[PDB]
Ligand binder design. Structure first.
Ligand SMILES: NCCCC[C@H](N)C(=O)NO
Ligand SMILES: NCCCC[C@H](N)C(=O)NO
Ligand SMILES: NCCCC[C@H](N)C(=O)NO
Ligand SMILES: NCCCC[C@H](N)C(=O)NO
Ligand SMILES: [Zn+2]
Ligand SMILES: [Zn+2]
Ligand SMILES: [Zn+2]
Ligand SMILES: [Zn+2]
Lengths: 206, 206, 206, 206
């Protein structure tokens, strides 16, 4: 069967509640990788995301490339983010989504620490390219983003990269949600017990 | 709708003519990001690149991370470079390719200065890793470099990072051209009028 | 009669146990040259290497070129490393593998002292270059590293240089083990009584 | 048809005349790559080799790995050696044979200088392994060396690596001369107008 994993990064943000409504209204479950600072200021949205059956994973504290990878703080930031999230939803998530992807940032050393810290790493198989259409008219932008993901949806499993801190991104989702549904896809959240590898390194320990 | 953008960096140099010839035989256009000192040493090579339908953009004067980013010479160096190139081909190009990529060197300040200067910044979506294959037979280095490229071309647009200043890179170009062409790609040069953002910062102003 | 001597340097490490299993699974014997710091921290892995029919040789304490060769600490470091290994496996190995190879580091003075100390020296006849392949997907890297080795196996004896301290390296070994066996090689460990010279200096006293 | 290019390195030496006799009486042509100091001390042998129709190439001045490749003195030494030989045989030879082979020593920069200085570079396709049997009974040693090349001779063109500064090598030559002669090989010397590439880098400019 075809399963589609919508993933949303850099949240929560001010369009997240509209997204959570749009998703719920189509009974569609998704995954959110949250930044620590946005977890601090939107505890409600965090609690709601988990409450409406979506997976709530980490996307670090600083979203800073040099700190995470060059200064080796990745796993440390993923753990601190994990704590903040656990304080709200009462579970300690294991799935991380690397800021800027894992390639080339997540070197062999840091990949051991992730494995040793108990974390998984997910990248994506489709880039919605939503960041291109920023600060542009929302509906035109969103329609293009929609077509971006739909025409690249070909494989039995797909992990789609989006950003709910962008209006054109959240606006893109309704057209994506059932356009993908007719191609036979279903919209699941990530489940830890059903982990399968999706990382640029093809590193199957994560 | 598929378009491959071969880009070659740190040229011109002693293999560039052989590469320019390979490009010509295949009627393939591409893009060159030049270092200022090589602009001055091989001024006729520059002419010919632009004369055969390739884009000529800048890749700095010093290629020195500390000077470019920590000290913020970037926009200066790309301007100086631009001037040299203009004096030879007439055009003042706008596109720049950052040494060592934009991430994390081009901070928001420099990025502001870039867009303020009218300049533009390209990174890449495929890294051929061509320059690292320098301690094996050239023909075998070229085959692994071609394979790297051919097996990552998937998106409707691909910006392929290469260097025309290593023999194994230029030797890879024939295999790469034939392979991608099998995959339905066209080999156009960058066009100024037809710009779309391609950078690690996801900053669509540049 | 064709024999392939897989040698693994700078271990033991965190992929070593998995390497030991893959070896064991193909009924294959190999050689390990160990650094002093890792013999101390992975003593079990050392005993297992020996216990499972592999040769356990030295690869110094510091892996530092200036201390080993410029300051002449080579024989000292190999002796200290020898002591550490013997406290674990109960025999004092004589074969050493020079960090960075013997050329040009092991000058005649040090080569004389090596000879006067009872030590043997092995360089290699095939460089897998496996450690250089740390910036691509691990399976892709392993396949190219396999290719490197398979295409250079031409002589009845081949001493292949690898590193069991990198993920892409241990992943390459299955394809190497299957290609070379198909090319007719057998995978033996170094035996001290059967010593034959393999060094860049063509010095057959080592 | 089959042609065998016997090449002898590091000479001339004290068995060179005995080899030149062994060659002449078997109506056999060869190639000698000479060290500058041995050219200085054996002008007769140098003159004789050319006078008797063999090719006389360079093998550098110091035979020092670090000087040649790391300090980039390779081409300088081949030119200084070229001068010495030209003063004897009245022509300036173009073919050089890299001490310790060209891999990895002859990097891309140096391969350009060799190309720009007008030099060619030959490695070999067969290593006689003659250095292993040094200071050993000449008779046994020579027989093994003879077969070493014989068991590795399969291709229409073969460049055998030998050393006429060793007794066991020169003694091996008679037996080699008859194994190859039976396989249909002919023993021609290298001649410059018929140059074809034989180098570990597969750099076909050399
Ligand atoms: N607005 C996008 C900035 C960062 C994009 C990058 N792909 C990432 O870290 N997504 O979570
Ligand atoms: N190993 C240093 C990186 C150099 C390559 C870099 N990607 C670049 O600027 N190419 O043009
Ligand atoms: N310059 C890289 C050093 C690694 C290769 C070297 N031959 C070695 O020490 N192996 O153990
Ligand atoms: N007696 C062997 C010393 C040098 C061997 C090496 N293969 C070489 O440079 N031959 O010319
Ligand atoms: Zn992000
Ligand atoms: Zn560059
Ligand atoms: Zn080592
Ligand atoms: Zn030599």
């Amino acid at each position: 069967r075809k399963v589609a994993y919508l993933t949303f990064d850099d949240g929560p943000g001010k369009y997240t509640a509209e997204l959570l409504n749009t998703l719920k209204q189509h009974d569609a479950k998704a995954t959110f990788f949250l930044i620590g600072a946005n977890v601090k200021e939107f505890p409600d949205l965090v609690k709601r995301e988990n409450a409406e059956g979506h997976y709530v994973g980490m996307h670090s504290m600083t979203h800073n490339f040099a700190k995470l990878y060059k200064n080796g703080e990745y796993v440390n930031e993923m753990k601190e983010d994990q704590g903040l999230i656990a304080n709200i939803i009462g579970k300690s998530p294991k799935l991380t989504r690397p800021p800027y992807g894992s390639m080339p940032g997540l070197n062999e050393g840091l990949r051991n620490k992730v494995v040793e810290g108990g974390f998984k790493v997910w990248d994506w198989t489709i880039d919605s390219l939503d960041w291109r259409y920023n600060k542009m008219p929302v509906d035109a932008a969103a329609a293009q983003i929609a077509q971006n993901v739909l025409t690249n949806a070909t494989k039995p499993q797909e992990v789609i990269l989006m950003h709910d801190i962008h209006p054109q991104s959240v606006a893109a989702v309704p057209a994506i949600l059932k356009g993908l549904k007719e191609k036979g896809y279903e919209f699941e959240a990530y489940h830890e017990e059903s982990h399968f590898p999706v990382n640029f390194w093809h590193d199957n320990r994560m």
